[PDB]
């Protein structure tokens, strides 16, 4: 069975692609891709269309993880069809669980991603506001999180 996970936060332009671009890598490194669905989407409808964030790119080409997205916003559908709803921080997490009790069926479970973090940061920072170091931050978390999640799922 296939199995699917969306990577949320506020704008889907900044944290969420990377996530999604990392979790990508890592399936795809396992032979295992085509048996993930996986996504990234925002809460909000301000940057639907936009690319995701200059400094996340340049992260991600250091790193060479692959990244290629358009921002999204996330739909009443997404709560039916995704197994996970991965999100960044506890404003995403108030406003996910907002929106899945205005919809009839949530297939999804709902977390922090960084509850998946061995080295325990439950909260991955909105690097919107700060610098090339604050997406650095961002990606090492993913990382950590992403391979956790891939290998037990909560």
């Given at each position: 069975?296939?199995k ?18 990392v979790?990508?890598?890592l ?54 069809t ?55 931050t ?13 290998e037990?799922?909560?």
């Amino acid at each position: 069975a296939t199995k699917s996970v969306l990577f949320v936060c506020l704008g889907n332009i900044c944290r969420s692609p990377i996530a999604e671009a990392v979790f990508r890598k890592l399936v795809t490194d396992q032979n295992i891709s085509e048996n993930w669905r996986v996504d990234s989407a925002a809460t909000s409808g301000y940057e639907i269309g936009n690319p995701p964030d200059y400094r996340g790119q340049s992260c991600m080409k250091r790193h060479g993880i692959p990244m290629s997205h358009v921002a999204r916003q996330i739909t009443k559908e997404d709560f039916a069809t995704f197994d996970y709803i991965l999100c960044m921080d506890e404003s995403n997490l108030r406003d996910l669980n907002r929106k899945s009790n205005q919809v009839k069926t949530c297939k999804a479970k709902i977390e922090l991603l960084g509850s998946y973090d061995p080295q325990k940061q439950l909260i991955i920072e909105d690097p919107y506001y700060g610098n090339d170091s604050d997406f650095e931050t961002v990606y090492q978390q993913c990382v950590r999180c992403c391979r956790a999640f891939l290998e037990k799922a909560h």
